[model samples]
Target: MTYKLILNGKTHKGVLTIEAVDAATAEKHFKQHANDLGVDGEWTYDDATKTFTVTE
Candidate 1:
Protein backbone atom coordinates (compact mmCIF):
# COMPACT_ATOMS: atom_id res chain seq x y z
CA MET A 1 0.00 0.00 0.00
CA THR A 2 1.05 3.60 -0.63
CA TYR A 3 0.58 6.72 1.45
CA LYS A 4 0.81 10.46 0.81
CA LEU A 5 1.34 13.35 3.22
CA ILE A 6 0.84 17.07 2.70
CA LEU A 7 2.70 19.44 5.00
CA ASN A 8 1.26 22.80 5.89
CA GLY A 9 3.62 25.07 3.96
CA LYS A 10 5.64 23.07 1.52
CA THR A 11 5.37 22.47 -2.20
CA HIS A 12 7.06 19.10 -2.16
CA LYS A 13 4.85 16.09 -1.74
CA GLY A 14 5.94 13.08 0.34
CA VAL A 15 4.87 9.56 -0.38
CA LEU A 16 5.73 6.04 0.77
CA THR A 17 4.66 2.52 -0.03
CA ILE A 18 5.27 -0.94 1.30
CA GLU A 19 4.77 -4.21 -0.50
CA ALA A 20 3.85 -7.49 1.21
CA VAL A 21 7.23 -7.67 2.87
CA ASP A 22 9.23 -5.57 5.38
CA ALA A 23 7.07 -3.31 7.56
CA ALA A 24 10.13 -1.40 8.76
CA THR A 25 10.49 0.05 5.27
CA ALA A 26 7.34 2.07 5.78
CA GLU A 27 8.59 3.51 9.07
CA LYS A 28 11.87 4.60 7.54
CA HIS A 29 10.11 6.25 4.61
CA PHE A 30 7.85 8.26 6.94
CA LYS A 31 10.76 9.28 9.17
CA GLN A 32 12.56 10.73 6.19
CA HIS A 33 9.64 13.06 5.66
CA ALA A 34 9.65 14.13 9.31
CA ASN A 35 13.36 14.86 9.08
CA ASP A 36 12.79 16.92 5.95
CA LEU A 37 10.19 18.91 7.80
CA GLY A 38 12.60 19.27 10.74
CA VAL A 39 10.19 17.83 13.26
CA ASP A 40 10.42 14.72 15.37
CA GLY A 41 7.43 12.46 14.96
CA GLU A 42 6.25 9.01 15.81
CA TRP A 43 4.41 6.41 13.73
CA THR A 44 1.92 4.10 15.31
CA TYR A 45 0.17 1.06 13.97
CA ASP A 46 -2.48 -0.80 15.90
CA ASP A 47 -2.68 -4.25 14.43
CA ALA A 48 -5.67 -5.21 16.55
CA THR A 49 -7.66 -2.14 15.53
CA LYS A 50 -6.13 -1.79 12.06
CA THR A 51 -5.30 1.84 12.51
CA PHE A 52 -2.35 4.14 11.82
CA THR A 53 -1.33 7.46 13.28
CA VAL A 54 1.53 9.89 12.99
CA THR A 55 2.16 12.53 15.63
CA GLU A 56 4.54 15.44 15.41
Candidate 2:
Protein backbone atom coordinates (compact mmCIF):
# COMPACT_ATOMS: atom_id res chain seq x y z
CA MET A 1 0.00 0.00 0.00
CA THR A 2 1.02 3.57 -0.51
CA TYR A 3 1.51 5.62 2.62
CA LYS A 4 1.83 9.34 3.19
CA LEU A 5 4.82 10.45 5.22
CA ILE A 6 4.68 14.00 6.46
CA LEU A 7 7.91 15.62 7.53
CA ASN A 8 7.88 18.40 10.08
CA GLY A 9 11.10 20.12 11.06
CA LYS A 10 12.24 23.29 12.74
CA THR A 11 13.11 25.06 9.51
CA HIS A 12 11.55 22.73 6.98
CA LYS A 13 8.15 21.12 6.59
CA GLY A 14 6.70 19.02 3.79
CA VAL A 15 5.21 15.71 2.73
CA LEU A 16 6.88 12.54 1.50
CA THR A 17 5.60 9.52 -0.34
CA ILE A 18 6.25 6.02 0.99
CA GLU A 19 5.36 2.74 -0.58
CA ALA A 20 5.02 -0.08 1.93
CA VAL A 21 3.12 -3.29 2.43
CA ASP A 22 2.00 -2.25 5.90
CA ALA A 23 2.09 0.42 8.51
CA ALA A 24 5.08 -1.07 10.31
CA THR A 25 7.13 -0.97 7.17
CA ALA A 26 6.01 2.57 6.54
CA GLU A 27 7.20 3.70 9.96
CA LYS A 28 10.55 2.04 9.46
CA HIS A 29 10.94 3.60 6.06
CA PHE A 30 10.02 6.96 7.49
CA LYS A 31 12.62 6.67 10.24
CA GLN A 32 15.39 5.74 7.86
CA HIS A 33 14.45 8.47 5.44
CA ALA A 34 14.23 11.00 8.23
CA ASN A 35 17.68 10.02 9.49
CA ASP A 36 19.15 10.26 6.03
CA LEU A 37 17.63 13.70 5.64
CA GLY A 38 19.00 14.80 9.03
CA VAL A 39 15.56 15.65 10.45
CA ASP A 40 15.39 16.05 14.20
CA GLY A 41 12.15 16.20 16.15
CA GLU A 42 9.20 14.11 17.16
CA TRP A 43 7.76 11.81 14.53
CA THR A 44 4.22 10.56 14.76
CA TYR A 45 2.29 8.19 12.51
CA ASP A 46 -1.40 7.60 12.07
CA ASP A 47 -2.38 4.14 11.00
CA ALA A 48 -5.86 5.28 9.96
CA THR A 49 -5.71 8.91 9.10
CA LYS A 50 -4.61 11.42 6.48
CA THR A 51 -3.37 14.41 8.41
CA PHE A 52 0.18 15.14 9.53
CA THR A 53 0.82 18.28 11.44
CA VAL A 54 4.31 19.57 12.17
CA THR A 55 5.12 22.42 14.51
CA GLU A 56 8.24 24.00 15.98
Candidate 3:
Protein backbone atom coordinates (compact mmCIF):
# COMPACT_ATOMS: atom_id res chain seq x y z
CA MET A 1 0.00 0.00 0.00
CA THR A 2 1.03 3.61 -0.51
CA TYR A 3 1.11 5.98 2.43
CA LYS A 4 0.57 9.73 2.43
CA LEU A 5 1.75 11.82 5.34
CA ILE A 6 0.74 15.44 5.85
CA LEU A 7 2.87 17.54 8.16
CA ASN A 8 1.26 20.49 9.87
CA GLY A 9 4.04 21.98 11.87
CA LYS A 10 4.91 25.43 13.12
CA THR A 11 8.00 25.69 10.98
CA HIS A 12 8.16 22.75 8.64
CA LYS A 13 5.21 21.67 6.53
CA GLY A 14 5.16 19.13 3.75
CA VAL A 15 3.91 15.85 2.45
CA LEU A 16 5.51 12.42 2.44
CA THR A 17 4.64 9.40 0.39
CA ILE A 18 5.93 5.87 0.68
CA GLU A 19 5.44 2.52 -1.00
CA ALA A 20 5.11 -0.09 1.67
CA VAL A 21 4.09 -3.72 2.08
CA ASP A 22 1.43 -3.14 4.70
CA ALA A 23 -0.09 -0.54 7.02
CA ALA A 24 2.29 -1.18 9.88
CA THR A 25 5.17 -1.38 7.48
CA ALA A 26 4.15 1.91 5.97
CA GLU A 27 4.17 3.66 9.34
CA LYS A 28 7.54 2.19 10.24
CA HIS A 29 8.97 3.35 6.98
CA PHE A 30 7.63 6.85 7.51
CA LYS A 31 8.96 7.01 11.07
CA GLN A 32 12.40 6.06 9.87
CA HIS A 33 12.37 8.95 7.45
CA ALA A 34 10.54 11.42 9.62
CA ASN A 35 13.61 13.29 10.75
CA ASP A 36 15.00 13.69 7.27
CA LEU A 37 11.53 14.71 6.12
CA GLY A 38 11.62 17.49 8.76
CA VAL A 39 8.84 16.14 10.89
CA ASP A 40 9.40 16.61 14.61
CA GLY A 41 6.30 15.02 16.06
CA GLU A 42 4.25 11.87 16.09
CA TRP A 43 2.06 10.97 13.13
CA THR A 44 -1.39 9.50 13.32
CA TYR A 45 -2.66 7.20 10.62
CA ASP A 46 -6.07 7.36 9.06
CA ASP A 47 -7.19 4.18 7.36
CA ALA A 48 -10.15 5.72 5.61
CA THR A 49 -7.98 8.35 4.00
CA LYS A 50 -5.10 5.89 3.78
CA THR A 51 -2.87 8.68 5.04
CA PHE A 52 -0.87 9.98 7.99
CA THR A 53 -1.01 13.37 9.66
CA VAL A 54 0.96 15.31 12.26
CA THR A 55 0.13 18.69 13.76
CA GLU A 56 3.15 20.27 15.41
Candidate 4:
Protein backbone atom coordinates (compact mmCIF):
# COMPACT_ATOMS: atom_id res chain seq x y z
CA MET A 1 0.00 0.00 0.00
CA THR A 2 1.09 3.58 -0.75
CA TYR A 3 0.04 7.18 0.05
CA LYS A 4 0.57 10.76 -1.09
CA LEU A 5 1.25 13.29 1.69
CA ILE A 6 1.12 17.04 1.18
CA LEU A 7 2.10 19.69 3.74
CA ASN A 8 1.74 23.45 3.82
CA GLY A 9 1.29 23.43 0.05
CA LYS A 10 4.63 21.72 -0.70
CA THR A 11 5.36 18.03 -1.42
CA HIS A 12 7.91 15.40 -0.39
CA LYS A 13 8.47 11.67 -0.62
CA GLY A 14 8.19 9.36 2.44
CA VAL A 15 8.12 5.58 2.36
CA LEU A 16 7.94 2.83 4.95
CA THR A 17 9.29 -0.68 4.48
CA ILE A 18 6.93 -2.14 7.09
CA GLU A 19 3.18 -2.20 6.72
CA ALA A 20 1.25 -0.01 9.13
CA VAL A 21 -1.70 -1.40 11.11
CA ASP A 22 -3.91 1.39 9.71
CA ALA A 23 -3.97 4.75 7.97
CA ALA A 24 -3.86 6.80 11.18
CA THR A 25 -0.86 4.85 12.35
CA ALA A 26 0.91 5.45 9.08
CA GLU A 27 0.15 9.14 9.20
CA LYS A 28 1.33 9.32 12.79
CA HIS A 29 4.66 7.69 11.94
CA PHE A 30 5.12 9.95 8.97
CA LYS A 31 4.33 13.09 10.97
CA GLN A 32 6.78 12.03 13.64
CA HIS A 33 9.70 12.04 11.22
CA ALA A 34 8.72 14.26 8.31
CA ASN A 35 10.37 17.31 9.79
CA ASP A 36 13.32 15.40 11.15
CA LEU A 37 14.30 14.71 7.57
CA GLY A 38 14.33 18.47 6.96
CA VAL A 39 10.94 18.56 5.25
CA ASP A 40 7.70 20.09 6.49
CA GLY A 41 5.77 18.89 9.53
CA GLU A 42 2.55 17.86 7.77
CA TRP A 43 1.75 14.66 5.87
CA THR A 44 -0.84 12.46 4.14
CA TYR A 45 -0.96 9.08 2.39
CA ASP A 46 -1.92 7.63 -0.97
CA ASP A 47 -2.77 3.93 -0.82
CA ALA A 48 -2.24 3.43 -4.54
CA THR A 49 1.48 4.25 -4.30
CA LYS A 50 2.25 3.62 -0.64
CA THR A 51 4.02 6.96 -0.27
CA PHE A 52 3.94 9.88 2.19
CA THR A 53 4.48 13.50 1.16
CA VAL A 54 5.41 16.21 3.61
CA THR A 55 5.82 19.98 3.57
CA GLU A 56 5.89 23.13 5.71
On TM-score, the stronger of 2 and 4 is 2
Pull out the clashing pairs in model 1.
none
RMSD vs true structure, all candidates: 4.6, 2.3, 1.8, 4.6
**Clash number by candidate, in order:** 0, 0, 0, 12
Q: Write the per-residue lDDT of candidate 3 for residues 3-53, one digit (tens) a residue.
A: 898878778778878887787997777776677667688668889877988
Model 4: per-residue Cα lDDT at residue 11: 58
Error of 3 at 19 (Å): 0.9
Better of 1 and 2 by lDDT: 2
Clashing pairs in 3: none
lDDT of 3 at 42: 63
Candidate 3 weakest ten by summed lDDT: 30-39
Candidate 3: C-alpha lDDT: 0.78
Give the distance in Å from residue 20's predicted Cα in candidate 2 to where it truly belongs: 0.9
- Candidate order, lDDT descending: 3, 2, 4, 1
Q: What is the C-alpha lDDT profile of model 4 across 1-56, one tens digit per residue?
A: 43345444345443345467777777776676665666655455567666666656
Segments in model 3 whose C-alpha atoms lie over 4 Å from true places? none
Worst 10 residues of 4 by lDDT: 1-10
Pick the lDDT winner.
Answer: 3
Model 2, 21-55: lDDT tens per residue?
A: 87778777777777677776676666677333333
In order, candidate lDDTs are 0.49, 0.68, 0.78, 0.58
